[PDB]
Amino acid sequence: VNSFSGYLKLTDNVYIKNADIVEEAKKVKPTVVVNAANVYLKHGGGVAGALNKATNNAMQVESDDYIATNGPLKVGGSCVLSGHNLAKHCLHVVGPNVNKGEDIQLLKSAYENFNQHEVLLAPLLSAGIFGADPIHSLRVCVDTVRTNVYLAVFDKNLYDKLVSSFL
Ligand SMILES: Nc1nc2[nH]c(=O)cnc2c(=O)[nH]1
């Protein structure tokens, strides 16, 4: 048993809810929250900007030190950093950004990072301002992630479309 509440079960391991991932993280304090990161860990907008704002910019300060030491992530890659006030850990995962012309085939590689963690609170990778079709992102998630993933979908309209179109 875990602390996640109000989710619809899609598969053996994937669950979904209409929720603001920031408010969900604050309530649950999951072991792992996933950030929709870019390779520079510049948390300006979308999910990343919202998570970072909720940490009072401490996520950005930590991220800047990580990049100064290690250089940028790969598209499809990830790093584990602090979860600050939101979670034990934040898994920063870089899905391809369609609005930058990145290969959508990298979305599967991005979701493979989730398999290193038994349970995660996550957004749909490459959705929102990353430009991919969220229906596609949910299909890749279900067909790639084998660990237990709790998906938070901010937009109620999109949530209802994801559920009602799910195969
Ligand atoms: N689940 C989810 N929650 C959010 N909350 C925000 O404040 C901004 N963006 C998102 C998002 O893209 N997904």
Swiss-Prot record:
Record's bilayer topology term: Multi-pass membrane protein
Protein name, entry field: Papain-like protease nsp3
Regulation of its function: Inhibited in vitro by GRL-0617.
Residue span(s) of domain Macro: 1-167
Catalytic activity: Thiol-dependent hydrolysis of ester, thioester, amide, peptide and isopeptide bonds formed by the C-terminal Gly of ubiquitin (a 76-residue protein attached to proteins as an intracellular targeting signal)
Function: Responsible for the cleavages located at the N-terminus of the replicase polyprotein. Participates together with nsp4 in the assembly of virally-induced cytoplasmic double-membrane vesicles necessary for viral replication. Antagonizes innate immune induction of type I interferon by blocking the phosphorylation, dimerization and subsequent nuclear translocation of host IRF3. Also prevents host NF-kappa-B signaling. In addition, PL-PRO possesses a deubiquitinating/deISGylating activity and processes both 'Lys-48'- and 'Lys-63'-linked polyubiquitin chains from cellular substrates.
Subcellular location: Host endoplasmic reticulum membrane
